[PDB]
Amino acid sequence: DPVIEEFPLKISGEEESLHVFQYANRPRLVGRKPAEHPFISAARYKPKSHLWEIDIPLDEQAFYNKDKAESEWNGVNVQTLKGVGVENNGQYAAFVKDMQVYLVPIERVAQLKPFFKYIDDANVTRKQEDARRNPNSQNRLTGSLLAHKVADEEANIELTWAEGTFEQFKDTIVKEAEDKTLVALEKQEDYIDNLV
Template identity: 35%
Template sequence: MDVEVPKFQNTPAQKGINGPDIEEEDDDPVVKEFPIFFSNKLAENLNLFQYPVRPSERPYVDAYGEGILDSRIKRDAGILEVDVPIDTTKFYDKTKAAKKWDSVNTQTLSGSISHPEGQMVGVFKDDELHLTPVFSTVQLRPQFKYVDKKSIEDREAVKLAQKDARSKEVKAVQMSAKSTGEQAPKYSGALLSFKQADDEEFVHLDWYDRDSDESWNVADRLISSNKESLDSDTLPLEYISMISCPHLDPSSEIHN
């Protein structure tokens, strides 16, 4: 991404309408300069996991005793799941958990993968900044699958009980033949994606803790070994025309 970003001057005329955060060049002098390097060794493999409901002071790492236990992915549907342990010592109703949810002690976090553009991860080392583009991001949220499981079980139990009561009555059975083609309903949109996601099997992923050697070895690849300066193939004007979105006047052919 070594492309020249177009420079704009901040005209005083615009000041009046701007927010409070415009930095003036004069009272914000350059203190120090660092070289920036671009690394793409992990370009296809760097994924950003976010835990929106977890404070950053308490990461899911083994060092805190709350490391991630297990992880799996549905690649086509773009669904990722990780299991984390539940702290059963605090704020945990053992009796209720035992009674209702088979003493659940892990929690599943899940999220759907998105591929944002223009995001990078930087490593600052030896006064050098090394940047690697992020391939995908996932926000992982708790899913409470045990609650769903319980409620489905309960409902089935009720159904079964009703069925038992009813099965004593004699009922006429009617048979009908259906052609195979009509049976599979045609879903579209969200229902289709749900069905596809439901049909896909989870693929197990090996998880390495933040502090493990494997993690640190991979992290080394964030540092670029190529220290040559990169030249842009794209001219500034070309770049500008690439990002521009001019108005297309259908009747312009007549006027020009």
């Protein structure tokens, strides 16, 4: 029952706007070792619709099938992952510095799943070229239809992808968290009284 060691737990970064991606296709462990992280080329994010789009260039030397891509898919060489950021409450991304656990709130979690926009583009181009050869007050949309329409109308924001910036984030989180020290107010029973 006596404690032999305690590790401090701090919270910082109320304005970081931290997001967490979840690649539904990329496995975490291959064999027994962690898998290599994919290389991200382009990133797009609609702000008010929270639509994340990540482009990953796939290898063309091995297992590419140049003919089909150059014929009907306009020579696509990048696989795109689309996801929607869901507001999840109570999630904190944590790191450890001098055996002290620092937490940063996670704003949204995105479920990135494969997207095939070239297939849709080919289909709509075929429909247009087959319809133009021989053809033969209203904003009452609410709910999912309005969300889909405002997502389609929305212009994507091109983001500058970057890596190797963990040092500045760690420095600012530790700097913000280390100075302040909070002492408790509520009793143990009072927490069980409301929303245990």
